[PDB]
Design a protein around this nucleic acid. Sequence first.
DNA 1: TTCCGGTCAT
RNA 2: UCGACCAGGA
Lengths: 107, 112, 97, 177, 554, 87, 270, 171
Amino acid sequence: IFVYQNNITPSAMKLVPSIPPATIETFNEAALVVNITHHELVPKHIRLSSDEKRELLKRYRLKESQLPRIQRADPVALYLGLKRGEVVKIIRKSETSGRYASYRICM
Amino acid sequence: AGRAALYKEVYNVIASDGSYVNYRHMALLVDVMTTQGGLTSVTRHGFNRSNTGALMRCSFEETVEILFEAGASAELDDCRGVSENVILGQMAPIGTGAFDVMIDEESLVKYM
Amino acid sequence: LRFGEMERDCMIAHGAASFLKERLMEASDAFRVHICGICGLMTVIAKLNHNQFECKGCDNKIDIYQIHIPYAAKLLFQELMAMNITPRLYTDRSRDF
Amino acid sequence: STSTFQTRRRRLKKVEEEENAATLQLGQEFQLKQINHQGEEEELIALNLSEARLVIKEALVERRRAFKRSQKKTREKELESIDVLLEQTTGGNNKDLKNTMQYLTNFSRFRDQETVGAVIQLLKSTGLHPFEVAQLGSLACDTADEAKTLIPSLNNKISDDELERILKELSNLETLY
Amino acid sequence: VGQQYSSAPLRTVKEVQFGLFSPEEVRAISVAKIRFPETMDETQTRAKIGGLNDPRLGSIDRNLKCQTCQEGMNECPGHFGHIDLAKPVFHVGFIAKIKKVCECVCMHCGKLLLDEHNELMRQALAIKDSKKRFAAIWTLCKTKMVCETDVPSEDDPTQLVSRGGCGNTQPTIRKDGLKLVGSWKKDRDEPELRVLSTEEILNIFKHISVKDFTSLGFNEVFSRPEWMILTCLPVPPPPVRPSISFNESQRGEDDLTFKLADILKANISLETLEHNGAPHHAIEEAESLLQFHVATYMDNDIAGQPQALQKSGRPVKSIRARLKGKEGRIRGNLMGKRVDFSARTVISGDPNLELDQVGVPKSIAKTLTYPEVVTPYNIDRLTQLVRNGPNEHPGAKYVIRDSGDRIDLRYSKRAGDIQLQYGWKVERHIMDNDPVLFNRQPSLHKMSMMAHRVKVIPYSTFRLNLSVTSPYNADFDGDEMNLHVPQSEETRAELSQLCAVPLQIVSPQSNKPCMGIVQDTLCGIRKLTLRDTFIELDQVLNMLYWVPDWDGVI
Amino acid sequence: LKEKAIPKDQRATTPYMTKYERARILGTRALQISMNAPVFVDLEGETDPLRIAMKELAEKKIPLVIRRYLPDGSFEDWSVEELIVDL
Amino acid sequence: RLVKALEDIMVHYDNTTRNSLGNVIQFIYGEDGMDAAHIEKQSLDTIGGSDAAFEKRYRVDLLNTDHTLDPSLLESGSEILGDLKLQVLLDEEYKQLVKDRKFLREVFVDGEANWPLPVNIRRIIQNAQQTFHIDHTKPSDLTIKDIVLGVKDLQENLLVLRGKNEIIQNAQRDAVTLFCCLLRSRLATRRVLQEYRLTKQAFDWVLSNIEAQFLRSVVHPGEMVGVLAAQSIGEPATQMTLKKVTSGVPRLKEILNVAKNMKTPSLTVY
Amino acid sequence: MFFIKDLSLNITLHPSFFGPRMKQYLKTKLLEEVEGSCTGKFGYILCVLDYDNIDIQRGRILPTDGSAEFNVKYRAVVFKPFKGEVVDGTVVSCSQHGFEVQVGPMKVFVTKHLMPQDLTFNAGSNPPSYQSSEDVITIKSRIRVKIEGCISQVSSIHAIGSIKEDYLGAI
DNA sequence: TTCCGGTCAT
RNA sequence: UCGACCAGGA
Ligand SMILES: [Mg+2]
Ligand SMILES: [Zn+2]
Ligand SMILES: [Zn+2]
Ligand SMILES: [Zn+2]
């Protein structure tokens, strides 16, 4: 995790995906001043083991596509750092039934 | 959280009037608009571009334009869309038709 | 009279499945055409007498179905073909799901 | 019509309908590898006359039976004995079956379900393909040439001596008249 | 539907495979050479020439013949014909792609412009979405204008690896009307502008690789890029472009039947130039005319103005136009149709009907019919209706027998006669308590259409109960309403079991009942309430008698 | 296809008959009854098919099987007999 | 538009909300699988009220002369005072109605306690009442075990989803939570005896009904919810006949279009 | 050569026959529309085996008329000649253009010029025949032919065969 | 937005 | 008899 101040040079960033398996992430200071997950509206998300996911699917008879999706650059998807394929479980409050379980895969 | 707002806003539009709509509806819509990825619009620009069949999207705002690129890209239509069948003249998989009916020859004997 | 779009949307909401079809087919268009089980088209030269059926080109005489669809639809199709676009009518799904 | 246990995905271009020859190349509907209703695989089913005469009779018979559970609620000698089994369990207008039993019963080569059994147990050690293992049973063959020539699909699949032995044991099992 | 039994099995459509016609197929299918542009008159002699419409295709004049296919008019759908063009033409609608494709592949050798070799490309080759590969691929190679022959592999940028060859510079391309033109940059300077002949484009495509097709949003079997260019033209049959006869000695030809006529003409003219005084490029002035018509025939609302107006200044109905949303085919013929067994008049309130009822005027109930099937259970009652005639009320007006034949109850020398047969149908009149779907447009509610009980009444109006007023959202200030009549024992069921007004009382759109009590009944129900309000015997008795379910207990 | 056929056990759908189902069964059965199909109940004098159906459907003497399809295509089979009919 | 954009959405037999692709759009219609039709504004008594008043109502202490059920209510009144094995269920209960309280105040921050919920319990009891001519005079005949242990046995049967596994049976609990809070809110020992003198008969009845009534309020796989929802919103849109914000109709238009440049942009910072 | 292939057929039953012994009727009809049929892809359908364990599966009710449609799966005995297949049958018809041998349910025809040469054709014979040095071919005479080719048609199958090779002719 | 006479003329 | 326009109804 690398925290830059005002910005990074377009010559540098093109050096992150050049050493797998390892992975790197770029975050701006001004964006981390406040934690978005703390916001009234943002419900808590949760990563899912490639075990817990292969489950969710089987239990609903779903194919990867039929699953609601979250953006690879989505604020929270970055907060947790998902990866194309990882599924997040979204649990929130509800004025119809206290809590509601939702799932979001990633693209 | 966007969904949360998108809904909150839509809810306000119907509330400003002194009317009432049961969550579920505005929710459902607010949801159809979100799932896909971010903010898909309820317009020929968005939703009517999804993976849905051709014949379906075909019946709204782009028709031929859409049909053309359908056979050009050799699309395949499931015929699971209400629309799909209405165009073919077949019973749509809808309530009454969300299932099949059969004569169980077996049970057809215990009855006598 | 006219069972326009909105009137449809209502029956769909109602779940009144068969009723909608009965409006759209039996009480309107409803037409019976023959197809090639091979190349999903209206090609089929049905002589419905000497039971001959053919369909030279995809050359058949054996695999032939018969379907009911709104005459308008038939037209929708023929019109599309004249625009050199091919809509295939297949009686069995092969893509699963 | 009457579909056949194998949905061959025909994608538009139906053009390759090979020939039908004793190159053991029978229509796609008769590969050595066909499918049984249970969903299993199974070798094609090759019937040599007189072996068929028995399968048919066998069902036409057991039909007349279950055709009465519900009813409540020597060569020239078998021609008459079969005509009846038809005018009882057949459509009568199945002029083919009539003519199939005559033929099937005239050119047949065995009368005992025991004799036909051995014929099979015998040829079924050849590893040959069903169609041959049929013609061999329904065609008289004195020489390996009469054989390997009226069933050219054999040619290199079995030594002439061997095939000659088999032919010996056939005329030896061939029931009299 | 259609009539006349067919030994052909019947199924429903399960999939719709969209594709493009291959000139070769178009030919095979066709049953008409279609060489002449004229319509009929074998020298004024009336009939049809082996030229256009019916050189073996469908018919007119109420005459069996449809290539012996007989059946005649109603039953014989069309039988496409074709017409061998002169020189390849674009497809008004595909031009967009055809262009976007060249920009993706270079001529001469015809192959992609970015192999697995370029990494940015890899990412664009994993995307499984015809619509998206081809939308990213294009974005990637629309820029590169040099058919690279040697590129730096997954190793050193020092070492250069080889693949396909022919660096022939790639020309950028722009769209002028119905043609494609591109400039080739020459260095040392100044451009090189030349027109890309269809004949040429078509070729480059024919040579595009098998895996190249697919990589770009295509399909080896149903849609090869090479098919976006028209070689052979399918000729929709009469039923697509019917005529209109004012008896005889006149005309009646359809718009389309003309554009073909033109396309045909403009075609022949061309041909007779390449086998005659061919001033080489005084032809491409008459080959643009073919590209034109064969374009306009399909699409006629383009950017390049020329509307292809038909003598009289009338626009010309292009095929596209026929499908274009609303008022047309897809949306106006398929998603919504006109229908039979329907009626509509003015509505008025009637405080004497139960909620779920609807007053239908004798007029109508004697007009609208319901097909009942003769059954021991009704034989009797049904035979009486038939007897009764189609003029008395409780009656019928059509008896149909197994032999698929209609007995017209108002003429048939046997009207009075007739013994029904278990199995026959007797289209009768609508009768008290025949479930019907009532409705008042605009319909934006489940409730804008509800099943009602039919109550045949005098006078000419659909008399609906008041409380079912607010759902339809109707007043009687001259408001009209539609009535539809079910047709299958099972259709009715779908109405009476899911649409019957009593059922609609509480609505999901706001988890609260959606019909109440209004005007008088409301205003009055308050007054009638007040402590101050008392009623004496004589009347309390009548009021009691009024509630039909009074237990008879004063 | 039988991998797409779910066992009577492992069954998971609603133990009760959906309003559409019954709506259709009744109709379907009514239609058949109107076609001169056999009636499995003593008609207490009834003579209307949908009326007969409603009766058949109350003594659960209707020989029909509702095959409920699932999003993925696999289905469950229920019998008017089984299905509870609240409403 | 609204319509065409949700035609294909219906509740499938699994109790999921999907479209023609099978793309789950809602895992449980409306996040509760209840058919809008069977719903009424009820009040979650457990929310509002002074922490003080909450006790005086739901608290039962069998180890206290002043905090026990007066034997004038229960039949086995005197023979309970002091029982320790019961004061465990009786405390289990209360620790729950309390967990409840905090839970709702975390969902409906507004304090608003009136919400739409299947099964109208108020009335279901109102009937229990005058159906058995219950006299607010003589004492009940409910075991404290009777009540508490039956209310617990009820929730087990309010099935929305059915599945034979954890992931599923786990949604079940979810899609019922709120309702139960209301349930426990109205079937708490103190209440059940002091407020509405129910007999064993009445209670066993009230339960049976809540179950059946509930089970009916579920949604029928088949309901074409999309079109429904569409209209339900698009309908009250026409009736829209017309503090300085963007407004109705045009605003809704603004929303469905997902327009970048909205007339009013505003933003409220607390 | 004769075969035992596993086929299936779809019958559409009118609600009328939704009786007690429906199964009975179905089967009954299966047979009406199979035994005696003919195809190019199955040839001659002769007899339905195992009449008793015929699988009917649950039939599904169509949806405009109560007619139900069951996929009756069965098994029976078929027979479809081939080109190059050798078979023997009894002659039936015999003209100046050759004779026609009857191999089972089918009729194979042999051309005058598809036989040998030493075999001419005698016209003034009763019944009509073909004479040789030591052989004589007429009506009842049994022959063994080699089917050169097959030609499917309607509800039958014809084929031309020769007796010009070796081990072919009379018996 | 949807649904539902007269005139002119091609 | 395919249409376009104008006027009008809830
Ligand atoms: Mg009005
Ligand atoms: Zn074909
Ligand atoms: Zn024809
Ligand atoms: Zn090149």
